[PDB]
Amino acid sequence: IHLDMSLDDIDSKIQNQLKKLQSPVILLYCTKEEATYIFEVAHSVGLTGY
Amino acid sequence: KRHFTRKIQLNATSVTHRPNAIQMALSVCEDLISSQVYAILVSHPPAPT
Amino acid sequence: EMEQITDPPRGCVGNTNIWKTGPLFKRVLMSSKYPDGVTGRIEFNEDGD
Amino acid sequence: HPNMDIAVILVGTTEEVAIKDVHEKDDFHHLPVTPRVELVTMQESDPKSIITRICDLMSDKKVQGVVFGDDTD
């Protein structure tokens, strides 16, 4: 997944794009701060869980 | 003139190209950012290297 | 027409932080609808081209 | 005489102090060309500040190498 926050829909597009995923092991790559935002979003998505 | 001037206003700032590589960017941190530009335009110089 | 926008950082000095306002300016600017122009029709692709 | 000109910088809260001096003492070591070092630190590091300082240092030091270090994240 390649995504960036653009205008007012990055969250929509990112959320729609991230929601599909089901995989157990995730490699993440981004700036540290972006990691903060992506993780908040993952916590909402439920991707951080066990 | 054409756009609403009561609500918002437009002011213009611009710089002559500098031969030294450093001035174009340095022209930005103080020259192009001290003034708080909302956007920048850029064009090829008369002499091109 | 958009709202709640913070001014850009004043001066390079002392600011290690990005500016929340600005990406949005790009978004509206890419979606501008003033097709009439001397140069020709204006619309912007995803890359901003 | 025959020594290379070098510069190193430290930034942020952390202080090198005596450790840098020890390195210089440690640094003479064994060699034919000797390092000549000028040290400067800056409490604050900026794109304009950092860019400015190293070149300014170029004017007096005229160093052929630079090492940069920071407390920053």
Can you describe this structure?
- The structure is cut from a larger assembly and holds 2 copies of chain A and 2 copies of chain B (49 residues).
- Chain A has 2 helices and no strands.
- Chain A has 50 residues and is mainly alpha-helical.
- Chain A is globular.
- Chain B has 49 residues and is an all-alpha fold.
- Classes of the chains: A mainly alpha (50), B mainly alpha (49).
- Chains in contact: A-C, B-C, B-D, C-D.
- At the C-D interface, loops of C face helix 2 of D.
- Chain A: It comes from Xenopus laevis (African clawed frog).
Keywords for this structure?
part of a larger assembly, 4 chains, A: 50 residues, mainly alpha, 2 helices, 0% strand, globular, B: 49 residues, 1 helix, elongated
Alpha carbon gap, first and last residue of chain A: 22 Å
Instruction: Enumerate how many helices of chain B there are, as a single number.
Output: 1
Radius of gyration of chain B equals 14 Å
- Overall morphology of chain A: globular
Which oligomeric form is depicted? part of a larger assembly
Name the largest protein-protein interface in this structure.
B-C, 8 and 8 residues
The helix content of chain A is: 40-55%
Biggest sheet descriptor of chain B: none
The helix content of chain B is 10-25%
Strand-pairing-aware structural class of chain B: mainly alpha
**What's the end-to-end separation of chain B, in Å?**
38 Å
Order of helices and strands of chain A: HH
Estimated share of beta-strand residues of chain B = under 5%
Family (chain D): Belongs to the glutamate-gated ion channel (TC 1.A.10.1) family. NR2B/GRIN2B subfamily.
Subcellular location (chain D): Cell membrane; Postsynaptic cell membrane
Organism (chain D): Xenopus laevis (African clawed frog)
Protein name (chain D): Glutamate receptor ionotropic, NMDA 2B
